[PDB]
């Protein structure tokens, strides 16, 4: 069964890359600016320095993940003024200069689809003190020593990295990953890529416009798909949710008595005096420190998750953006052609564009051909017959040719191989 | 507040506001030490100069937020000064802002990195992403290599760790039989 | 961990023997329980951190074994898997609690601009490079491998024909020498 027509499909692969760089002050969460509780806490020693060290490692690790994912090229390339690409329309993925930021149209859709429940990365003192009618969650976290540090790389700069990667991929193929970035017409990158999947380049040139149109149409459908279905980005949204959820539970755990008379330190201290007050304070301290330890442990597990995902994303960037991946279903279902990166809050998105055989026909075949007793095997492709004539054709596309000595090779004779048939080899 | 309600509480069930018994007005309570403080510094053995980032504050309102009137003088010099710089992360004090972009040395955040430079002082700047480069694309132009090089790179990977082992009885009790006997009530923690 | 033996955890003292020499079971056991739970907590924390780091190190070790298999025992086609550049080989070297790979790679060094075209028309039929690309220095058309300048004269054994030169975009007029 040989394909005769094909299609170019575009698939979306979403990968989380980073998390919110949380940080925690023990003294506020546990004690709340009370010197006596801090003094009792000092008896516990280096629990809190250990927690702070762990969370600092988490933050540094997230920044490293983002850097090693996106910053794989040390030259900031920019698209040329002339968008001549042999009919291939790259306008929904490149930066829009009229737009304030350099986010692409698709990137704008992505940022507008997933919701970042953090009130942005700015929340001033006066912002919280004016927001006394709603009791904002983020303010409640902030007053209890829970802070969200900003990422080192802002979205402007991630977008710049992606634009540079796209410029290198489109104008230079894989050469910009291997040392210096050269220049190649895009159709010739396509020719190389088709050669990479065992497809002769000549077919693409023979249908070039169609393929470009298909690609462009596919891109449009992505834009149509992404603009309606919210669940598509769930893989990222849940991450945010999970982190938020954790913080919420943590602050709610300040309401727990843990067997104490009250959850409020000041109530105990105003009601009770050291010899038996310290017992209740110890109970509260161990409960809250337990909650913090649990939170940090969960964050560490999730960080191992996200580092695995980020390593996978960097591998995809290296093997599919900076090159063509022979790994099957590594960069989307189908014979991989390319992948385009797009940023996203705490994650990345790959538009994997792939070849898929579309229409096929049954034919009759045979491994070899006997000419004068000697057995001829296809140098490339396979022997095929339409019932009257034998031809040779590439495996993944119907394109017969007349059998000739320069299309086949001879090894042995036709009395040994199974399935050989009688025919003639035209001798030029 | 309802007539029978005396205290209000937030999500954390800490007292958020109080109705003053004498003058029936409601006052919110906020912690004194609001706002993290991060110290940017070159390593010791080189210099003792530092800079301070106050996160998510306006440089106009840094002193009131940090309660600068109450601190010691050596914190008040970093509370306000001529090297005050605003950034999306917060207010940075003790480092002069530099237009020139460089590679990151110490990351602050929001694209801002600092370093120590000799003007013998600490500088803060927007990081350089790398040299800006452009590509001479055209529909009928190729760039072909004619010479090459063989390069050697080093890739370091940790493989193992120290095979630590722990005896509970020594660490927890220290060869004391009574403490071990009390420990046995806990069961199979230590075997685990 | 050893410093956490100095912690009282709310007890009168961090030393077991002091409590036992000063206090007797009915209320001594409470302080002893406090110390035991604190120290067992510290141990549990240490073991948890060690487990996380062990998962890290196993991931790194699996990656290192993969590099050894795919770059020392073979040549890796994976881009930037074994160092920046077209991978040639990797050499292992030991190290305390780790390994080091000397990845030796090819990198194009000097380059020149040239003029190109996908195909060549000879007598109406379109010729495509069997390998490499068509290139011109302004006077003659040659075929050359992608990653190194090495032109040759175009011949029928360097190209192949498919269709005609009225369909492909960018084809140019030239001649194919017939041996
Ligand atoms: C091979 O299949 C493709 C579709 O996968 C065909 O493209 C369509 O052809 C029909 C009929 O010519 C047109 O009406 C459509 O507009 C084409 N698609 C697009 C996106 O334009 C292609 O024609 C087929 N080729 C052969 C030789 O059968
Ligand atoms: C790429 O596709 C777009 C279709 O989205 C072509 O037309 C542009 O479409 C956008 C949005 O639909 C409009 O804002 C522009 O005004 C359209 N351009 C024109 C010239 O009408 C666009 O032309 C295509 N790119 C190329 C190079 O043809
Ligand atoms: C393919 O052609 C060969 C050559 O003619 C055939 O070999 C002959 O087969 C007949 C079958 O009865 C024998 O009597 C002859 O002695 C064979 N001659 C030789 C030189 O081998 C072969 O049978 C043909 N096979 C098919 C499937 O057509
Ligand atoms: C191709 O480039 C290499 C360097 O990458 C050249 O090698 C150097 O050539 C110069 C001039 O001949 C010598 O002085 C150097 O000693 C060479 N390098 C070494 C390490 O010995 C090489 O000559 C170039 N080849 C061509 C044809 O230009
Ligand atoms: C390449 O050569 C062909 C063959 O001579 C050219 O085709 C001719 O083009 C002229 C242009 O005015 C027409 O008047 C002739 O009728 C064409 N003849 C044939 C047989 O096609 C073609 O124009 C040339 N192209 C280039 C770029 O030089
Ligand atoms: C030291 C230096 O170059 N400072 C300049 C400053 O004078 C100027 O106002 C600003 C842009 O407005 O750019 C920076
Ligand atoms: C190939 O043959 C099978 C069984 O004879 C049939 O079901 C199928 O439709 C055929 N496909 C084509 C393209 O003829
Ligand atoms: C098979 O291909 C030959 C090639 O010339 C053609 O003449 C013949 O009509 C074809 N037969 C069928 C059934 O397709
Ligand atoms: C293929 O199978 C058929 C029966 O299904 C059999 O008659 C034929 O001999 C087989 N092919 C060869 C080369 O033996
Ligand atoms: C630390 O100081 C000593 C002596 O002053 C010097 O030998 C050493 O190089 C210094 N280290 C660094 C990292 O500057
Ligand atoms: C407070 O910060 C905003 C932006 O966060 C800024 O526009 C404003 O100027 C600042 N306040 C003053 C008094 O400048
Ligand atoms: C190639 O052309 C571009 C633009 O014309 C130019 O900047 C570059 O230096 C050229 N390179 C060579 C090797 O001639
Ligand atoms: C192009 O190559 C041919 C090959 O013989 C040579 O004769 C000619 O001088 C070259 N021209 C340039 C400009 O390099
Ligand atoms: C390549 O682009 C130029 C303008 O930049 C144009 O004149 C030329 O026709 C294009 N090439 C082809 C084969 O059309």
Curated annotation (Swiss-Prot), chain B:
Region (Disordered): 63-82
Effect of residue 131 to V: In strain: Beta/B.1.351, Iota/B.1.526
Locations listed in the record: Virion membrane; Host endoplasmic reticulum-Golgi intermediate compartment membrane; Host cell membrane
Applied biotechnology: Main component of the anti-COVID vaccine Chadox1/AZD1222/AstraZeneca; in which the human tPA leader sequence is added in N-terminus to enhance protein secretion.
Reported impact of residue 55 to H: In strain: A23.1
Effect of mutating residue 97 to Y: In strain: Gamma/P.1, 19B/501T, 19B/501Y, Omicron/BA.1, Omicron/BA.2, Omicron/BA.2.12.1, Omicron/BA.2.75, Omicron/BA.4, Omicron/BA.5, Omicron/BQ.1.1, Omicron/XBB.1.5, Omicron/EG.5.1
Glycosylation-annotated residues: 45, 58, 99, 118, 139, 147
Listed result of changing residue 12 to D: In strain: Alpha/B.1.1.7
Source organism, top-level taxon: Viruses
Impact when changing residue 146 to I: In strain: Alpha/B.1.1.7
Post-translational modifications reported in the UniProt record: The cytoplasmic Cys-rich domain is palmitoylated. Palmitoylated spike proteins drive the formation of localized ordered cholesterol and sphingo-lipid-rich lipid nanodomains in the early Golgi, where viral budding occurs.
Annotated effect of mutating residue 56 to G: In strain: Alpha/B.1.1.7, Beta/B.1.351, Gamma/P.1, Delta/B.1.617.2, Epsilon/B.1.427/B.1.429, Eta/B.1.525, Theta/P.3, Iota/B.1.526, Kappa/B.1.617.1, Lambda/C.37, B.1.1.318, Zeta/P.2, Mu/B.1.621, 20A.EU1, 20A.EU2, Omicron/BA.1, Omicron/BA.2, Omicron/BA.2.12.1, Omicron/BA.2.75, Omicron/BA.4, Omicron/BA.5, Omicron/BQ.1.1, Omicron/XBB.1.5, Omicron/EG.5.1; common variant; binds to hACE2 more efficiently; produces more infectious particles when cultured in primary human epithelial cells; does not significantly shift SARS-CoV-2 neutralization properties
Cystine pairs: 59-91, 104-113, 168-190, 173-179
Free-text comment on this protein's domains from its UniProt entry: Contains sequence and structural motifs very similar to those of a bacterial superantigen and can directly bind and activate T-cell receptors. Activation of a broad T-cell repertoire may be involved in the hyperinflammatory syndrome in acute COVID disease. The KxHxx motif seems to function as an ER retrieval and binds COPI in vitro.
Other noteworthy facts: Variant D614G has become the most prevalent circulating sequence in the global pandemic since April 2020. The mutation is associated with higher viral loads produced in cell culture and animal models. It would not change pathogenicity nor neutralization properties vs vaccination. May be prevalent because the mutation increases virus transmission in human population.
Annotated family: Belongs to the betacoronaviruses spike protein family.
Name this protein carries in UniProt: Spike glycoprotein
Organism of origin: Severe acute respiratory syndrome coronavirus 2
Gene that encodes it: S
Residue span relative to the full protein: 559 to 762 of 1273
């Amino acid at each position: 069964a040989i394909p005769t027509n094909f299609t170019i499909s575009v698939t979306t692969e979403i990968l989380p890359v980073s998390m919110t760089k949380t940080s925690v002050d023990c003294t506020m969460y546990i004690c709340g600016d009370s010197t006596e509780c801090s003094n009792l806490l000092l008896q516990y020693g280096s629990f809190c320095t250990q927690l702070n060290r762990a969370l600092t490692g988490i933050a540094v690790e997230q920044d490293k993940n983002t850097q090693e994912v996106f910053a794989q090229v040390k030259q900031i390339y920019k698209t040329p003024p002339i968008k001549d690409f042999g009919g291939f329309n790259f306008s929904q993925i490149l930066p829009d200069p009229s737009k304030p930021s350099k986010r692409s149209f698709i990137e704008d859709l992505l940022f507008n689809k997933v919701t970042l429940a953090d009130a942005g990365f700015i929340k001033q003192y006066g912002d919280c003190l004016g927001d006394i009618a709603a009791r904002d969650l983020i303010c409640a976290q902030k007053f209890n020593g829970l802070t969200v540090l900003p990422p080192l790389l802002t979205d402007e700069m991630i977008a710049q990295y992606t634009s540079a990667l796209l410029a290198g991929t489109i104008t230079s193929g894989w050469t910009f990953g291997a040392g210096a970035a050269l220049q190649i017409p895009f159709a010739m990158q396509m020719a190389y890529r088709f050669n990479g999947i065992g497809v002769t380049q000549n077919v693409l040139y023979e249908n070039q416009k169609l393929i470009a149109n298909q690609f462009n149409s596919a891109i449009g459908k992505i834009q149509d798909s992404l603009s309606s279905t919210a669940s598509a980005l769930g893989k990222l949204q849940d991450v945010v949710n999970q982190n938020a959820q954790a913080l919420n539970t943590l602050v709610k755990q300040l309401s727990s008595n843990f067997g104490a008379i009250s959850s409020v330190l000041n109530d105990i201290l105003s009601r009770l005096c050291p010899p038996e007050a310290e017992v209740q304070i110890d109970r509260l301290i161990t409960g809250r420190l337990q909650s913090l330890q649990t939170y940090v442990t969960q964050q560490l597990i999730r960080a191992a998750e996200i580092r695995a995902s980020a390593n996978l994303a960097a591998t995809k960037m290296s093997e599919c953006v900076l090159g063509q991946s022979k790994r099957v279903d590594f960069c989307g279902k189908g014979y991989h052609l390319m992948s385009f990166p797009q940023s996203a809050p705490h994650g990345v998105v790959f538009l994997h564009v792939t070849y898929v055989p579309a229409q096929e026909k049954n034919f009759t075949t045979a491994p070899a051909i006997c000419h004068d007793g000697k057995a001829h095997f296809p140098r490339e492709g396979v022997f095929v017959s339409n019932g009257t004539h034998w031809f040779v054709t590439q495996r993944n596309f119907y394109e017969p040719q007349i059998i000739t000595t320069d299309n086949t090779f001879v090894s042995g004779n036709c009395d040994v191989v199974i399935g050989i048939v009688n025919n003639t080899v035209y001798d030029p | 507040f309802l007539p029978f309600q005396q205290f209000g509480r937030d999500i954390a069930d800490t007292t958020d506001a109080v109705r003053d018994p004498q003058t029936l007005e409601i006052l919110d309570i906020t912690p004194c030490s609001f706002g993290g403080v991060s110290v940017i510094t070159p390593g010791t053995n080189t210099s003792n100069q530092v800079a301070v980032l106050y996160q998510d504050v306006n440089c106009t309102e840094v002193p009131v937020a940090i309660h600068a009137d109450q601190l010691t003088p050596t914190w008040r010099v970093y509370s306000t000064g001529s090297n005050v710089f605003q950034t999306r992360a917060g207010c940075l004090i003790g480092a002069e802002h530099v237009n020139n972009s460089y590679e990151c040395d110490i990351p602050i955040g929001a694209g801002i990195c600092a370093s120590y430079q000799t003007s013998q002082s600490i500088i803060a700047y927007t990081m350089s992403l790398g040299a800006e480069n452009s590509v001479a694309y055209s529909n009928n132009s190729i760039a072909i290599p004619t010479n090459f090089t063989i390069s050697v790179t080093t890739e370091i990977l940790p493989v193992s760790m120290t095979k630590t082992s722990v005896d509970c009885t020594m660490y927890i009790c220290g060869d004391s039989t009574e403490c071990s006997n009390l420990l046995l009530q806990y069961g199979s923690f230590c075997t685990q």
